[PDB]
Nucleic acid binder design. Sequence first.
DNA 1: CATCTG
DNA 2: CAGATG
Length: 327
Amino acid sequence: ETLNGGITDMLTELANFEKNVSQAIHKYNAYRKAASVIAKYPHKIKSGAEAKKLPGVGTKIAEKIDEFLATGKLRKLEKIRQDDTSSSINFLTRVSGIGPSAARKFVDEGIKTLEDLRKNEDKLNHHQRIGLKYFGDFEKRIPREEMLQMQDIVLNEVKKVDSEYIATVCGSFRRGAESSGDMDVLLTHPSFTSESTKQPKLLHQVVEQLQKVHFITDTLSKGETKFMGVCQLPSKNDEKEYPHRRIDIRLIPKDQYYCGVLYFTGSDIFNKNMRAHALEKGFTINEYTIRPLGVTGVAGEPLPVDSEKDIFDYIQWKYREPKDRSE
DNA sequence: CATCTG
DNA sequence: CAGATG
Ligand code: NA
Ligand code: NA
C-alpha cells in the first residue's frame, strides 16, 4: 500500500503505455498483474530477483525493478514521458469520444492538440465534437450544491410526465460526496420489467421533457434504454451561466431496480464486501439480482426485492445508509 | 454492455 | 458486420 508503491506506480505507467501508444495488450496486461501481485506483497521489495520470485513476474520486469531500485528512475520511463507522440495520445484521449485508437489516427495525421482538433472539426464525429466543445466544462468537477439543483429538476420533470416513474440518482452523490464527476440517473417504471416486452417510450418520453425544459442540451447517444447526454442548469440572472455537465439516464425493469441501484451506488469496495458476504450467507449478487445459492456448485433463481432493504435482509445484514456504504 | 460509425 | 467508446 506504500511499501512497494514506486514499483507499483512505474509498472502501471508502463502498462498504460503499452496499451495506449503501442498496441501491446499482452504487454499491457503483463504490467498489470505484476503490479497487482507486487501490490499484495507483504514485504519491502529489495531487489529484482526477489520480485521475480513472484508469479507474473518475469525477467523483464525484474530487470526493470532493479534499475528503478538501483536509481530513482527508469530510462524507458524517461524516454516515454518526453516523446511528443506518446504525449499527444495521452492528451487527445482526454476528449470525450476519442479513445486511443482514434488518438493514434489523428496523431498520424498531425492533429496533436486542441487547436488541431478545431481546425479539423470535419474529421471528428458528433460525440467527439461535443466533447471538443465542452472540453473544459467536461473536466470540471461537479459540486453537490449543483448536484441538488440538478436532482431537483430531473425528479420534478420525471414526476410530471408520469407519477409512476421512479428515478434515483446514484453515484457518490448518493453516498454523500462533496462533488462528483457526472450525473447518473437510474430509471424504472412498474410497467417495465424482465419479461414485459419493451417500452422505449418509457425512456424517450423523459428525455424529451428534459430537453423540453432545456435541461438537456445535447445527445451523445440515445438508445432504447440508455441515454448519454449533456445537461445544464439554467443560467439564473445573466452573469453566471453554468458549465455543461455529463449525464446518463438508464431504464431498468422494475423487477431489477434495487440491485442496480444498490450496485451503482457503490463504492466498488462496499460492493465487493457485500458481495462476498452474500456469498457467505448462501447467496449471489450482481448488477440485476440476488439468487439463492444451490450447493451442487452453483445454482440460480431470482429472489424478490422491493428495496435495498430486501437485499441486505436477504444476506442478513445491517442496512447501510448510503453514506456509510463507503467500505 | 449498449450505442454509434462506416 | 467488426471495432470503438464510455
Ligand atoms: Na476520451
Ligand atoms: Na479480430
